Subunit: 233 residues, 6 copies
Amino acid sequence: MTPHINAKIGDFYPQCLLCGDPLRVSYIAKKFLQDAKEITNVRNMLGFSGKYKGKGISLMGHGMGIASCTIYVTELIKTYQVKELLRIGTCGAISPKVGLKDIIMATGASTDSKTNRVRFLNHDLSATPDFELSLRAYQTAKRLGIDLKIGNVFSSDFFYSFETHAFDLMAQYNHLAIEMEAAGLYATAMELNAKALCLCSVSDHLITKEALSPKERIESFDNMIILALEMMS
Amino acid sequence: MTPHINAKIGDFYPQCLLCGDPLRVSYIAKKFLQDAKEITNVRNMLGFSGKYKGKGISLMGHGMGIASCTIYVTELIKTYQVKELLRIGTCGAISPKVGLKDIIMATGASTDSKTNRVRFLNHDLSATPDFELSLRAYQTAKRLGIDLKIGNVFSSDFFYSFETHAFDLMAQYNHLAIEMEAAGLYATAMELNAKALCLCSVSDHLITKEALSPKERIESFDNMIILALEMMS
Amino acid sequence: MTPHINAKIGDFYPQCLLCGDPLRVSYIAKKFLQDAKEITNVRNMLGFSGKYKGKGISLMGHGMGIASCTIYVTELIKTYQVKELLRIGTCGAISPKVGLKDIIMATGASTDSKTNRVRFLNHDLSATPDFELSLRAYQTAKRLGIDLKIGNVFSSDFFYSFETHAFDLMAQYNHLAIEMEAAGLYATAMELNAKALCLCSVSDHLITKEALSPKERIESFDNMIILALEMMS
Amino acid sequence: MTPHINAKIGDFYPQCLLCGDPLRVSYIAKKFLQDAKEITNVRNMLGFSGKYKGKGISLMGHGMGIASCTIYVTELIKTYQVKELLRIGTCGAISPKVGLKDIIMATGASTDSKTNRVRFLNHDLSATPDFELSLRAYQTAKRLGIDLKIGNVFSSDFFYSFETHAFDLMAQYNHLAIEMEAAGLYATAMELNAKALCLCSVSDHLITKEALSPKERIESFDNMIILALEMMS
Amino acid sequence: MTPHINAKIGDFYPQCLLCGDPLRVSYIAKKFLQDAKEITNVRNMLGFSGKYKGKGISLMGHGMGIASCTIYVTELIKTYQVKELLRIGTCGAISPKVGLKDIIMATGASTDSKTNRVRFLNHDLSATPDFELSLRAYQTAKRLGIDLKIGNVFSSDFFYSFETHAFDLMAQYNHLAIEMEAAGLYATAMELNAKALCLCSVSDHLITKEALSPKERIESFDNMIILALEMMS
Amino acid sequence: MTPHINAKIGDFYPQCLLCGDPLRVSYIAKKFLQDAKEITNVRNMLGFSGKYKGKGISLMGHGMGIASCTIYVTELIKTYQVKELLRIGTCGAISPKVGLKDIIMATGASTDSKTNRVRFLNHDLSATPDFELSLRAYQTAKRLGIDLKIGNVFSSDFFYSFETHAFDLMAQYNHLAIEMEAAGLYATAMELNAKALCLCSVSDHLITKEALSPKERIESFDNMIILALEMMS
Ligand code: HPA
Ligand code: HPA
Ligand code: HPA
Ligand code: HPA
Ligand code: HPA
Ligand code: HPA
């Protein structure tokens, strides 16, 4: 029991997929899992447990931004004993080497947040995923024929911004897209000794100005979902 | 249309109540409004429009943390033309001058976030509410007999923390409680020329270690809700 | 006894008006008080005690800038037991909604100083006035017919600056004027549990380039002075 | 004409002594100068011009703290064309190698202010005096038999502080005393191409807890005053 | 031609091994390469080109610390067109999961330097290696039977330090060791679009207080050297 | 014995000259010293002891950048008991008041490094040389007829940079040139109670775009070398 999660200890399997959108979490539960059970629903933030190809797997929403994400994965790990967390989110492309609905594997998450300086003695924490998990994503993607765009993302506290050249500067330093949680996920998992990785599909393209719709941000990423399930098997 | 809000321009009245919990938003819509209509539900984040004592009033969830809160109130103001925003949230008491379920009116919101330094040339932005709105809360509370605890809050990116003396230091500087959105609400509303105020009821007490339950964080604050509705009339 | 104040404990009433200019302090003592007594004069920084409409009231200069201001109000509170401090200063307008000699009530004081980060764990301290005092200023001003411009000010360590767009950015965030002490006054009073408020009359207008003379910065603000005396009665 | 200085261009000689205390400025004018004229008195901050051993010399108060000091020396240089500025102030000893009324020549001024980061692209500005001036102080002191304690000072925005080990750390890095203006004097003079130096006599000893009285901070430093006059001749 | 490198464009192969110690660079050139040629020797910082198993490979020293390292890899990439850089350095273990002469593959490099904030708009740059290169190290190590310790390192500007609990905090966040260049290597390579990776063998153990000798820091790491050569083939 | 220095305690005289280039150290040993002995050579970083005009004097390389420099002078002082350190380096002119091969005496070293904030409680450490040593350089230079350009330098973590106006800003604040170690030398020597000074000859001119060759950075500065030897006699 926590303020933000309804479940009981033991309702989460040691492996969990995460999205910011609890309706994408719910879409995965209905369409892709076998006998999925809704295990938590505080604040409308749904989580599920189910089976994929016989293997037990949980799903959990984490809301938008580092602060929200940190609340949920801190609770998932410390209270519910989750050991592997795989975010499958959305992001805004800043590279011309990626298009709408490309899947990005974030091997580092830069940030404009202060959370990691607060965690880490006002130094620069290099927020990174678990290496075996990213190895696992790479092999599963190749064994499935899924093209994976690999690089850094920029985890921002902001979605709306008048910046322009800051995006060029991020792209110049090999950042493929902008999202809002990976750096918090990575740092919390480092703190609490869990294995984490973040994949994100391109829902917005800041160069071409393309943007998916709310429901397309649920429905348009099934290869991302399949990759995540296949590697958690 | 935005990525995070379903409504159409015109579905929001110029005055809106806000909670982090969309189920508290929904509880207010059912119990306190007349003919409330669900106007948005992306990501399970519900908003409503309705009437209170004949006056039109909207409700909207904003999730947890400054980054989430900023997304929604940026959209509420710039896209949906909302002019007055009154957050009615929860907070964790750090003062022995306040107990569980006291209502705190935040006349300033300190923060450990970097968002305001990013907004404001790496200077110190004093995140404050609209003065008329806080005047309005003060008179409505006195005209209703509601005791209002008035002071600063600390808006943190963190809910879980091993800090101890940092809380004494916040209390020493007249901070009554900790929450996670007021400073973002205030700064975004300053940027976009809207009127904002944050009230928060004490759901956790960091001195006595009392903590309400998830549903009590919905149900235990009806004087806060009534005060907010009465001042938006 | 302190290095900077001559008076004896008990020479200050629990309520004190403050200016940066000790000659404005002296002007208020001569013209507006009954039987004012000079109680301190170290470094030419004059303070007085007197009566207004029968009520005892003290006056004290605090010099220019946060560091100077902090020295005097730290001593006023800790040594001389002053409980209410009302600065009545000058400021430079950055809003076209205010003209020369408008009175600004500062409900928040942003700053480019490091003093509050040093005080407050390198976080953002939202430097705010006492709420009852600002309520008291608002009602007294309306009961007297004085138009009060209400908003944030920016307390700078600098008077002279080549900045330009930084001023637009401050104005965009609802800052009405620039001065140099409010944030230090507010933070010191928060630390030491006194009630503080800052009013400032517009002596310079950064848009129109108007600027009062040294003596006009003493003489041109009698409604500010009257408002301050009337609320301390 | 400026907001803070009464004099006319030409009333200041190109060489000026400075104190925070305008009454120490006045004490030097009466006792040590020939036919001293009060040339400015805004805000009770007195300045004088006079002759010493036939050589013209000006005196000027600058108040307490970097922000105040910066206002006056910016005006002295840009408006009044002052070319050499020699502060002769007070300071609080943190070294056991110095006693009450020792004279300290500050060849660097560390600071806890943000002013130099604001001036200097958020880098570390090493605030230093003019070299010829410090050479001149060294030879004049030896040619007069005055023992000069030479080292860094720490220019703080704070006079009152509960720090303890921070003072040990400053002493460990060869800081002899704490004062409140040298770093601003040095940086402003660097900006505006004037020659500046700061001497400070020990008025407080933070180890032994000795502290001079307000008038002793005027009267107890005549060798400092004589050294300053002799080098400006 | 640069101030720091003697070679001619074309003397460096597109793949280069790097050490801080140019004598370790020289040891690799003598013992492991075929017909190695010394191609640069400014400041005694030796670089070589040679062949390993028929494949051309270069070696280059980079000195100690981020600033030194950045000079050399900026020149290697921009002037000499080097495309792949593989540092094989030394580090100080802070984990009890690693012993003297373990090989650490750094999938992120935290830092206490300001260089990446200067590069990256005062945000947090997550300094990471090229993913294919780390994949290549992982497979080559397994295909050779070399046990690879995988995790973050902390790149410090300091070798000597009285810190204690800061090391516990780094270890708590999954940092295996401390060194002094990886973060600069990674960030410069990100800027200039080269592929970089850092391996480091444990030469000091901060828990057990073991420390190798200067020559052992040359000679004790042949599996690291072999792994690097085998993956550059 | 240290990881970076071969010598034995007692092989260093209490006075040492320093260069970044160990080949400039070696050039001074051959050409200017009597019976110079190579006393250390770890990492190709050569140091020597010898006699000049009968007086014992040591030489030592320190590599490039603050981090490298700090390692060597920390060891020189704490392990080898060196008491006086005189860097004679190269720098890049940003003033039109200095030309190629001018000698600059650095009476302060600004920096873009974080090392001094880490050392000094995140305050501004004014990194300065020993005063007697700079007095000694000034008199020896005049007694020899050597023109000495005196002022601040900017110690950067970067050699290559696209900055432009930042250089104007440094020049505006009386910085004569850019180098990469003085601030670390000064701060380490302050920490460890040694006497340090930095001279630097202009090897690059950022205004005129002149740049010496690698060997000219060894050979073109004999008056600097002679001045350093003459003052250590
Ligand atoms: O454009 C974006 N910015 C930040 N987060 C996002 N998630 C999807 N798109 C975006
Ligand atoms: O304890 C708390 N901390 C932060 N936010 C909160 N909202 C309710 N309680 C808390
Ligand atoms: O223009 C100003 N700037 C700062 N403080 C002031 N006080 C009056 N005018 C000003
Ligand atoms: O103790 C002090 N602190 C700061 N400034 C001072 N000026 C004289 N004494 C002091
Ligand atoms: O202990 C160390 N600290 C920093 N760098 C190092 N390189 C080898 N050992 C170390
Ligand atoms: O141009 C330079 N920049 C930094 N350090 C230097 N040392 C010689 N020239 C330079």
